[PDB]
């Protein structure tokens, strides 16, 4: 029993982290096979309106210093794919895991391995917000740190860190260099859009709570999907879809509580608050656990 | 910016996890050099009053099946140190990190690598509670999972998981087999004692909040250590010591807020609640971040 914000074991990713230096800028890169991936803004000198095509044409391989621990890797090629720089190196990473690159949907969670100067610092879990920012923990030097999920022994990379926005939340790309959200790797007035709460995740966490013995929020009522969504939109929650209801199926079956029954609990909680009580140690409704996350942690999958 | 419950990178520990099987019982072991450590209750058949001296005398080396991935390790010796079994194996772990064994004080935090059948599942952070339990996330099969801190590249192991108590919290030992708290590895009526909140940690997290721009709880007042402790004891908080005040020094200096000034804020928060506001994303006062944890994450140390 118990329920914690749990990240994936990070070792397979630690073995891929390197330091990329271009000029006076240093950040992190991801070394898989004979290629190092990193944010293309490593080539900028500080930026208002950079032309990265021009900036990269003016670089050579010798301008890129890649260090894996203390061993310097020799850069033998360099190209640009969207907002990611790919540096071909002359030796393949002997620690390359089985991996793939995936672009996730908002509401999905992943583990972040925060890194500085190519050295892992810490691991934590977060979600892709509906407004395509993440609420991470990132200091200067963290650019190029990656987010990932692990299935079997395959690492699915889904995030590379590029920027902190003015509100202190974070923006980045998939491993093909495409930003999540409307953001651009430049200094402009861009800001995080209005966010919403991830309804299906909140319901997943309520199921997690029941599995762990928190039942005080349950009630005898059921609601209709349409009438629940009426309340969801009023409290700035994402609409619940039949896809979401179907995804909550296995948890609904383990606990014997129908999805629309649990929706009636969430409506009550939104309308009345918790009256000084807590759920799984929280005084607010938690929305960064997916249904998969709840089953994984409350049933026990390993990697 | 940002502030997350951050665990240490787990890879150095993943390389040490193995499966120990004795009879029909399977759990996890920790393989360092040519020794595998695991909870001694792996030799029990289910237990009301086990005599582990008798139970171990009746075992041989061949009763212990140790698997590191798929490679079976040959057990060449077996002994008992307090509540931990030590199985000498015929090959040293090639992935042994620089390590040491430490026994921590209540209020200290560590990362847990939850494991099943020798395979890492997930990593999370927790604190040793004042009542010497931890609020972990542990399913059947998790015994022998370890907790640790990492400094430089040295892993300090401080917890091995032995038991879930009736309230769903967890009990275990240091890596020398000594339980934290009064617990015993037997089936009895033992229960978690009354817990308290870790005051110095709460203050550390309030400093973390200021560093991250949450200032609404600050005020012009200061309190005396004695008058603060008067309020602490009323709300079931641990007494604040001059050692604690001194430990909060560097954070007090970075923010320019005196410890006893911050204590006045905490008194106000205990007496009045938050009035619907949050701090670092929480609606309750968080107490599982040490002062070291705050400096590490708000300043940037790596390993
Ligand atoms: N690492 C690194 C680094 C190294 C040298 C120089 C600058 C950086 C950098 C650059 C950006 C940035 C910001 C914008 Cl608005 C647009 C663009 Cl293109 C890049 C940034 O956000 N951070 C950062 C800081 C804190 C948390 N998270 C990310 C650090
Ligand atoms: N693994 C494992 C395992 C394998 C085979 C048989 C039993 C176990 C076991 C044994 C104990 C236990 C409990 C008490 Cl009260 C006293 C003693 Cl000596 C041991 C236990 O608590 N768990 C457990 C369960 C859930 C979360 N965390 C810990 C699992």
Residues of B in contact with A3 (CB under 8 A): 137
Four-residue CA torsion sign, B208, B213, B216, B218: positive
Q: Which residues pair with A125 in a beta bridge?
A: A111
CB B127 within 8 A of CB B108: yes
Ligand 1 mutation target, pool A83, A133, A163, most atoms within 8 A of CB: A163
CA distance linking residue B99 with residue B92, whole number of Å:
14
CA distance linking residue B201 with residue B289, whole number of Å:
5
B193 in contact with A at a CB cutoff of 8 Å?
Answer: no
Sheet bearing A75-81, strands edge to edge: A71-73, A64-68, A17-22, A25-32, A35-39, A84-89, A75-81
Dump strand ranges (E) for chain A: 17-22, 25-32, 35-39, 64-68, 71-73, 75-81, 84-89, 98-101, 109-116, 119-127, 146-151, 154-164, 170-173
CB A79 within 8 A of CB A135: no
C-alpha torsion A288→A291→A294→A296, nearest 10: -120
Could you tell me how many helices (H) and strands (E) chain A has, helices first? Answer: 8, 13
Contacts of the segment B92-96: beta carbons below 8 A, 24+ positions apart: B92/B33, B92/B34, B93/B15, B93/B16, B93/B31, B93/B32, B93/B33, B93/B34, B93/B68, B95/B12, B95/B15, B95/B16, B96/B15, B96/B16, B96/B31, B96/B32, B96/B33
Are B297 and A122 a contacting pair at CB < 8 A? yes
User: Looking at ligand 2, which atom is closest to the CA of residue B190?
Assistant: 15
Instruction: Match 């994450």 to its residue by tokens.
Output: B297
Burial of B300 (0-12, 13-18, 19+ CB in 10 A): middle
Residue B142 CA to ligand 2 center (angstroms) comes to 8
Residues of B in contact with A136 (CB under 8 A): 2, 4
Burial of A49 (0-12, 13-18, 19+ CB in 10 A): exposed
- For ligand 2, atom 3, the nearest C-alpha belongs to B141
| B275 CB-near residues (< 8 Å, 6+ apart) | none
Nearest to A103 by CA among A157, A43, A182, A172: A157
Beta-strand relationship, B25-32 and B35-39: antiparallel
Instruction: Match 């010798």 to its residue by tokens.
Output: A62
Instruction: Match 């020794």 to its residue by tokens.
Output: B35
Q: What angle do CA B270, B273, B274 make, to 5 degrees?
A: 125
Beta-strand relationship, A64-68 and A17-22: antiparallel
- For ligand 1, atom 11, the nearest C-alpha belongs to A163
B301 in contact with A at a CB cutoff of 8 Å?
Answer: yes
Nearest to A204 by CA among A300, A299, A301, A288: A288
CA distance linking residue A7 with residue B113, whole number of Å:
10
Exposure string of B244-269, with b = 16+ CB inside 10 Å and e = fewer, is bbebbeebbeebebebbbbbbbbbbb
CB A115 within 8 A of CB A27: no
Distances A11 to A114, A187, B11, B96, B110 between C-alpha atoms, Å:
13, 34, 3, 14, 17
- Give me the phi and psi of B207, to 5 degrees please: -65, -45
CB B30 within 8 A of CB B158: no
Half-sphere exposure of A205 (CA within 13 A, CB side): 23
What's the 3-state SS for B177-212?
CCECCCCCCCCCCCCCCCCCECHHHHHHHHHHHHHC
- Pick B297's closest partner by Cβ from A2, A137, A283: A137
CA distance linking residue A35 with residue A175, whole number of Å:
12
Four-residue CA torsion sign, B118, B122, B127, B130: negative
Residues 133-152 in A contacting B (C-alpha not used; CB under 8 Å): 135-141
Ligand 2 mutation target, pool B164, B182, B186, B192, most atoms within 8 A of CB: B164
- Pocket lined around ligand 1, Cβ cut-off 6 Å: A 25, 27, 41, 138-143, 163-164, 185-187
A303 in contact with B at a CB cutoff of 8 Å?
Answer: yes
B8 in contact with A at a CB cutoff of 8 Å?
Answer: yes
Token pair of B285, please? 């006062």
DSSP A210-225: HHTT--TT--S----H
CA distance linking residue A132 with residue A106, whole number of Å:
6
Helix or strand holding residue A227 (H, E) = helix A225-234
* Listed resolution, Å: 1.6
User: Looking at ligand 1, which atom is closest to the CA of residue A143?
Assistant: 1
- For ligand 1, atom 18, the nearest C-alpha belongs to A185
CA distance linking residue B2 with residue A129, whole number of Å:
15
Token pair of A289, please? 């656990």
Instruction: Match 């000594």 to its residue by tokens.
Output: B178
Are A5 and B3 a contacting pair at CB < 8 A? no
| Tally of CB atoms within 10 A around A135 | 18
DSSP conformational letter for B241? P
Give Rg (Cα) of chain A. 22
- For ligand 1, atom 20, the nearest C-alpha belongs to A163
- For ligand 2, atom 11, the nearest C-alpha belongs to B163
Active site residue A41: yes
Four-residue CA torsion sign, B284, A196, A138, A16: positive
Instruction: Match 């071909």 to its residue by tokens.
Output: A88
Instruction: Match 């583990």 to its residue by tokens.
Output: A111
Residue B190 CA to ligand 2 center (angstroms) comes to 14
User: Any idea which residues of B carry the catalytic annotation?
Assistant: 41, 143
CA distance linking residue B168 with residue B191, whole number of Å:
10
Residue B302 CA to ligand 2 center (angstroms) comes to 35
- Pick A9's closest partner by Cβ from B113, B125, B140: B113
Residue B161 CA to ligand 2 center (angstroms) comes to 9
Report the structure determination method.
Answer: X-ray
Distance of CA B122 to the CA centre of its chain: 14
A153 in contact with B at a CB cutoff of 8 Å?
Answer: no
Most distant CA pair in chain B, distance? 69
| B248 CB-near residues (< 8 Å, 6+ apart) | B200, B203, B204, B207, B259, B262, B291
CA distance linking residue A287 with residue A237, whole number of Å:
10
**Residues composing chain B:** 303
Burial of A254 (0-12, 13-18, 19+ CB in 10 A): middle
Nearest to A299 by CA among A203, A211, A205: A211
Residues of B in contact with A113 (CB under 8 A): 9
Beta-strand relationship, A75-81 and B109-116: unpaired
Residue A141 CA to ligand 1 center (angstroms) comes to 7
Angle at which helices B259-272 and B199-211 cross, to 10°: 100
Q: Go through chain B and list every residue after which a break occurs, taking a C to next N gap over 2.5 angstroms, comma-separated.
A: 46
DSSP B131-181: TS-B-----TT-TT-EEEEEETTEEEEEEEEEEE-TTS-EEEE-TTSPBST
Nearest to A3 by CA among B160, B5, B176, B299: B5
**Residues composing chain A:** 303
| B53 CB-near residues (< 8 Å, 6+ apart) | B80
Helix (H, G, I), strand (E, B) or coil at A265: helix
CA distance linking residue A302 with residue A81, whole number of Å:
34
CB B68 within 8 A of CB B14: no
A253 in contact with B at a CB cutoff of 8 Å?
Answer: no
- For the Cβ of B81 lying below 6 angstroms from any atom of ligand 2, the answer is no
Q: What angle do CA A181, A186, A190 make, to 5 degrees?
A: 50
Helix or strand holding residue B75 (H, E) = strand B75-81
Helix (H, G, I), strand (E, B) or coil at B281: coil
Ligand 1 mutation target, pool A115, A116, A164, most atoms within 8 A of CB: A164
CA distance linking residue A111 with residue A134, whole number of Å:
11
């Amino acid at each position: 029993s118990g329920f914690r914000k749990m990240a994936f074991p990070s070792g397979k990713v630690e073995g891929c982290m390197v330091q990329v230096t271009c000029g006076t800028t240093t950040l992190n890169g991801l070394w898989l096979d004979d290629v190092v991936y990193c944010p293309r803004h490593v080539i900028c000198t500080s930026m208002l309106n950079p032309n990265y095509e021009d900036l990269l044409i003016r670089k050579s391989n010798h301008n890129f210093l890649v260090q894996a621990g203390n061993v310097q890797l020799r850069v033998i090629g360099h190209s640009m794919q969207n907002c990611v720089l790919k540096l071909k190196v002359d030796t393949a990473n002997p620690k390359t895991p089985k991996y793939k690159f995936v672009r996730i949907q908002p509401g999905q969670t992943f583990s972040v391995l925060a890194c500085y100067n190519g050295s892992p610092s810490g691991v934590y879990q977060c979600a892709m917000r509906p407004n395509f920012t993440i609420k991470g923990s990132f200091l200067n030097g963290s650019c190029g740190s990656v987010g990932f999920n692990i299935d079997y022994d395959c690492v699915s990379f889904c995030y590379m860190h590029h920027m902190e926005l003015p509100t202190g939340v974070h923006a980045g790309t998939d491993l093909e260099g495409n930003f999540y959200g409307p953001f651009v790797d430049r200094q402009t007035a861009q800001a995080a859009g209005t966010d919403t709460t991830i309804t299906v995740n909140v319901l997943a966490w309520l199921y997690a709570a029941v599995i762990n013995g928190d039942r005080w929020f349950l009630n005898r009522f059921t609601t209709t999907l349409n009438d629940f969504n009426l309340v969801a939109m009023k409290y700035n929650y994402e609409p619940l879809t039949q896809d979401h209801v179907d995804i909550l199926g296995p948890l609904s079956a383990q606990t014997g509580i129908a999805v629309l029954d649990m929706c009636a609990s969430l409506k009550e909680l939104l309308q009345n608050g918790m009256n000084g009580r807590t759920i799984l140690g929280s005084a607010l409704l938690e929305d960064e656990f997916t249904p998969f996350d709840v089953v994984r942690q409350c049933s026990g999958v390993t990697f």
